[PDB]
């Protein structure tokens, strides 16, 4: 039940645009397309206000209602081609655009697809643009990784796994202390505080993932021994196909001083330049 009085008065009129009527959504519970700690996701067919059939992914939270709605309201207002949108909430079901090619990590690990170095850098550029948008909205992601970005039918990469879509979709990479330690900035491992600058650290690791086509970072390090490993004066090595200036970008993302790491705007600029030097 929706109690409009419990909400922030400013946000009441935004409820009609976030709530999806149960008669407008068909969800196919016979086919699981993704698994999270909070719940499974399924295929869905959504009907528009006019009556157009759009394909969607419907996530369950199986495994405050006022708070849940405001979270959805804030997320719906986010609109960028490199950020996963919220279609709405159904009575609770989270309704998201269907991403045909799944998560970025699995996509680049797939033997049937063959992205070129240019393509891989382009995927990186797309993530940087999505994060530039999010950071301008003062939104800290906290869990940027290749596993947490998705691709649609046009191979458009979108920053996902945030707001109501947030979950652990690959439990292997989360350690109790439940943190994604191998994507975390030194200061975050120490304080558990996450910033846009710690998102920038995670982006550098994401770039390394792209250039290795989805290799696991720091395989021979065990969980929280990562802080010891890093403080020995170590960084992830330069992947074979990674251009030198792109590795220089990665090293900047992993600067020991958070305030010295590049903004996402600078990452878009630097990476767009490197991307432009390649053909095919
Ligand atoms: C074709 O298969 C799928 C599966 N899941 C979704 C989906 N899931 C919710 C979601 N929101 N943000 C994220 C980030 C990562 C994953 C994820 C899912 C599986 C493995 C690894 C990571 N899922 N996810 C949303 C939209 N389209 C999808 C299409």
UniProtKB/Swiss-Prot annotation:
Superkingdom of origin: Eukaryota
Upon changing residue 41 to I, the result is: In RCCP; constitutive autophosphorylation
Compartment(s) where it occurs, according to its Swiss-Prot or TrEMBL record = Membrane
Ranges for region Interaction with MUC20: 254-280
Q: What would changing residue 173 to C do, according to UniProt?
A: In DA11; not phosphorylated in response to HGF; severely decreased tyrosin kinase activity
Which residues get modified to Phosphothreonine? 223
Listed result of changing residue 173 to F: Complete loss of kinase activity and of ligand-induced ubiquitination. Alters interaction with PTPN1 and PTPN2. Loss of interaction with PTPN1 and PTPN2
Q: Where is the active site?
A: 143 (proton acceptor)
> Residues where Phosphotyrosine occurs?
169, 173-174
Q: In which tissues is it expressed?
A: Expressed in normal hepatocytes as well as in epithelial cells lining the stomach, the small and the large intestine. Found also in basal keratinocytes of esophagus and skin. High levels are found in liver, gastrointestinal tract, thyroid and kidney. Also present in the brain. Expressed in metaphyseal bone (at protein level).
Where are the stretches annotated Interaction with RANBP9? Answer: 151-280
Q: Outline which residue ranges sit on the Cytoplasmic face.
A: 1-280
* Residues noted as binding ATP in the record, renumbered to the chain: 33-41, 59
Q: How is it modified after translation?
A: Dephosphorylated by PTPN1 and PTPN2. Ubiquitinated. Ubiquitination by CBL regulates MET endocytosis, resulting in decreasing plasma membrane receptor abundance, and in endosomal degradation and/or recycling of internalized receptors.
What would changing residue 174 to F do, according to UniProt?
Complete loss of kinase activity. Alters interaction with PTPN1 and PTPN2. Loss of interaction with PTPN1 and PTPN2
- Residue ranges annotated for the Protein kinase domain, each copy included: 27-279
Query: What does the UniProt function comment say about this protein?
Result: Receptor tyrosine kinase that transduces signals from the extracellular matrix into the cytoplasm by binding to hepatocyte growth factor/HGF ligand. Regulates many physiological processes including proliferation, scattering, morphogenesis and survival. Ligand binding at the cell surface induces autophosphorylation of MET on its intracellular domain that provides docking sites for downstream signaling molecules. Following activation by ligand, interacts with the PI3-kinase subunit PIK3R1, PLCG1, SRC, GRB2, STAT3 or the adapter GAB1.
Q: Domain note for this entry?
A: The kinase domain is involved in SPSB1 binding. The beta-propeller Sema domain mediates binding to HGF.
Give the UniProt family note: Belongs to the protein kinase superfamily. Tyr protein kinase family.
Its assembly, as annotated, is: Heterodimer made of an alpha chain (50 kDa) and a beta chain (145 kDa) which are disulfide linked. Binds PLXNB1. Interacts when phosphorylated with downstream effectors including STAT3, PIK3R1, SRC, PCLG1, GRB2 and GAB1. Interacts with SPSB1, SPSB2 and SPSB4. Interacts with INPP5D/SHIP1. Interacts with RANBP9 and RANBP10, as well as SPSB1, SPSB2, SPSB3 and SPSB4. SPSB1 binding occurs in the presence and in the absence of HGF, however HGF treatment has a positive effect on this interaction.
**Disease linked to the protein:** Activation of MET after rearrangement with the TPR gene produces an oncogenic protein.
Spell out the protein name for this chain: Hepatocyte growth factor receptor
> Which organism does this record belong to?
Homo sapiens (Human)
Q: What is the lineage of its organism?
A: Eukaryota, Metazoa, Chordata, Craniata, Vertebrata
Q: Which residues of the full protein are shown?
A: 1052 to 1346 of 1390
